[PDB]
Amino acid sequence: MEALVLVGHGSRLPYSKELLVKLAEKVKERNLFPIVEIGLMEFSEPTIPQAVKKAIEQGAKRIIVVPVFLAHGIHTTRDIPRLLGLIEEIPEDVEIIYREPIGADDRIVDIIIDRAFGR
Amino acid sequence: MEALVLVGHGSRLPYSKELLVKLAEKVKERNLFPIVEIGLMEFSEPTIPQAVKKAIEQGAKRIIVVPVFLAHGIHTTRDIPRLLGLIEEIPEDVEIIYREPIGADDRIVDIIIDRAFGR
Numbered sequence A, B: 001m002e003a004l005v006l007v008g009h010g011s012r013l014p015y016s017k018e019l020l021v022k023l024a025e026k027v028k029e030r031n032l033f034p035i036v037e038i039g040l041m042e043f044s045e046p047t048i049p050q051a052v053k054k055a056i057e058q059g060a061k062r063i064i065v066v067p068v069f070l071a072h073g074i075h076t077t078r079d080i081p082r083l084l085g086l087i088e089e090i091p092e093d094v095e096i097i098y099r100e101p102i103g104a105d106d107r108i109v110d111i112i113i114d115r116a117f118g119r
């Protein structure tokens, strides 16, 4: 009934998509959502609209899109809302819920500190 | 003796730099490092080389550079190591230690899950 779509930038290198994929795997491991899908903005497949369609086709009425990005930018404020047609398609009776990026979360400062220490 | 330099992409929007800055503030608040500096790759000041010089000028011999990026890409594997002259202005008796990005860390999946729930 609800689907989680993780959305990433995309890269010409593969690392970015690997990251999204490992992220999806890990949230799958927590058994919280019925459907869990990924989409990249540029370069790679699946694309965002592809992932959104794939989610609807599995019978989701409420689509939770999380931008896996540290900050807001043009990607998160123009391109992506556009691609989900929240600015400029999708069954009338389906709502896309566009969430917030990671931001300056305490857990990020934990992660950064670990990274400083080669841990 | 050791300095932490947080390094970010930069955007034409301000959000990115705000993020770096809030991150620096938070790690400053944890009193773990003598010196804590930020640099953006493009669009904004301070720049990476500026932040590195600012760190040396405060008497740091070991400079810990953490790329605040989710994944590896061109920025983290070419441009930044280049800018720190690790592949091709640094006193010979100073070492730059180039750390790892955030990656698919469990704490990120925690954060993502929170974001799905509008928390």
Ligand SMILES: C[C@@]1(CC(=O)O)c2cc3[nH]c(cc4nc(cc5[nH]c(cc(n2)[C@H]1CCC(=O)O)[C@@](C)(CC(=O)O)[C@@H]5CCC(=O)O)C(CC(=O)O)=C4CCC(=O)O)c(CCC(=O)O)c3CC(=O)O
Residues within 6 Å of the ligand: A009, A010, A011, A012, A013, A016, A042, A068, A069, A070, A071, A072, A073, A074, A075, A076, B009, B010, B011, B012, B013, B016, B068, B069, B070, B071, B072, B073, B074, B075, B076
């Ligand atoms: C290689 C390249 C390929 C390409 O994307 O074209 C690339 C790659 C990546 N960017 C990433 C991150 C961001 N990129 C932006 C913004 C811009 N990045 C741009 C270009 C390029 N970015 C190409 C370099 C061409 C060159 O320098 O030679 C601009 C100029 C053009 C544009 O993107 O349209 C645009 C400036 C604003 C504008 O467009 O006006 C923002 C901020 C924002 O969005 O405002 C973030 C924050 C991300 C975050 O916060 O997480 C990540 C993952 C970052 C991560 O993992 O954290 C990758 C992956 C990788 O580097 O391989």
Ligand code: NI
Residues within 6 Å of the ligand: A009, A075
């Ligand atoms: Ni981009």
Ligand code: NI
Residues within 6 Å of the ligand: B009, B075
């Ligand atoms: Ni870039």
